[PDB]
Structure 1
Amino acid sequence: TVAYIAIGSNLASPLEQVNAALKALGDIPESHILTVSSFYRTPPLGPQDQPDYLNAAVALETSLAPEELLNHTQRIELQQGRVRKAERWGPRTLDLDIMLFGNEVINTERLTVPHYDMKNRGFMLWPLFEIAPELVFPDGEMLRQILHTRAFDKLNKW
């Protein structure tokens, strides 16, 4: 099954964190990376006195179950999601989200697939669109259609 994973990091200098995350995604068992989007630079949500985010999309081929895949992405967030600040480990700055999982719809305590708010977020839609422009959601909506309708600006690359 082809799973699409969103990556976000709002570290001040996130390239190594994001690359460590990508390698970690590549090491998940029963799975392999098919494609990775460009890296984009996006302003954060809420107030603008915060660091920008690096966002990207990853296509992962996997024979894991959705919630097993979620165990792995949450494990990576726990192991790699904090950078060591001088006196301590800093706040988590890495987000890994399952946007789509094959054509499946999932509504569990732990997992909402398609991602619960991706259609509001160009920083999720545009990286996905770069690696799956023809994508159709389980319910028949089309990724192209959502971007056309909302007209979210194209993102700047990192």
Structure 2
Amino acid sequence: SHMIQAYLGLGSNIGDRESQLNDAIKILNEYDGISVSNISPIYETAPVGYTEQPNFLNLCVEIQTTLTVLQLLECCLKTEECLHRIRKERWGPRTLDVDILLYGEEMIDLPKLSVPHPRMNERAFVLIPLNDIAANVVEPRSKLKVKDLVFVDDSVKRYK
């Protein structure tokens, strides 16, 4: 029951993107061991990786959690599988990504999981919305607080 403060990164680029983010937050907070305590603004971001796909909506969430980072990962995975289910086949699959960004001030390096991801520092679609809710949290790989990692990126803009 020692509570860890974690940050998650959420994204959806196809379907009702905002409603997808919204549901993921709700589902995560429904776990006995997770309490959603803050949410960033939503940002519309240009796709990173494949450039030929729709824009994402991204946000980040602060949680107070008594789960271990792997149990938290489980909750993330279950939430993805759940909001991926088709609504109507002809509409196609729905989308949602939920990543653990920060878990207390710990560096976690397991074969199935790295928290923070070592390349998270590259991602404005993460850092910008992260900075709205975790500006003063130290990202342990770099040793920089999130407010000092965040950089200018015009491909990321507030959505509402």
Same fold (TM over 0.5): yes
What is the CA deviation profile of residues 25-70 of structure 1, one whole-angstrom value per residue up to 9, with x for unaligned ones? 1112212011000111011024543110000000000010000000
Conserved in 2, the CA contact under 8 Å of 1:26 and 1:32?
yes
2:123 counterpart of 1:121: yes
- 1:77 aligns to what? 80
Which sections of structure 2, spanning at least 5 residues, go unmatched?
Answer: none
Secondary structure of 2:71's match? helix
Conserved in 2, the CA contact under 8 Å of 1:12 and 1:51?
no
Report the AA paired with residue 69 of structure 1: L
Conserved in 2, the CA contact under 8 Å of 1:12 and 1:52?
no
In 1: Cα distance, 2:41 partner to 2:155 partner = 12
In 2: Cα distance, 1:20 partner to 1:119 partner = 26
What is the CA deviation profile of residues 110-150 of structure 1, one whole-angstrom value per residue up to 9, with x for unaligned ones? 11011232100100000000011112122422222222xx5
Structure with the larger strand share:
1
Compute the displacement of 1:88 (Å). 7.6
Compute the displacement of 1:7 (Å). 0.2
In 2: Cα distance, 1:88 partner to 1:41 partner = 22
- 1:157 aligns to what? 158
In 2: Cα distance, 1:49 partner to 1:3 partner = 32
How many residue pairs were aligned? Answer: 155
Distance 1:88 1:153, change over 3 A: closer
Report the AA paired with residue 5 of structure 1: L
Identity score, percent = 34
TM-score normalised to the size of structure 1?
Answer: 0.88
CA RMSD of aligned residues (A): 1.9
In 2: Cα distance, 1:110 partner to 1:94 partner = 19
- 1:13 aligns to what? 16
- 1:95 aligns to what? 97
Which piece of structure 1 moves more, 103-112 or 51-60?
103-112
Compute the displacement of 1:155 (Å). 3.1
Report the AA paired with residue 156 of structure 1: K
Which sections of structure 1, spanning at least 5 residues, go unmatched?
Answer: none
Compute the displacement of 1:89 (Å). 5.7
1:55 paired residue among 55, 58, 67: 58
Conserved in 2, the CA contact under 8 Å of 1:122 and 1:152?
yes
Report the AA paired with residue 152 of structure 1: D
Conserved in 1, the CA contact under 8 Å of 2:60 and 2:130?
yes
In 1: Cα distance, 2:20 partner to 2:135 partner = 27
Compute the displacement of 1:87 (Å). 4.5
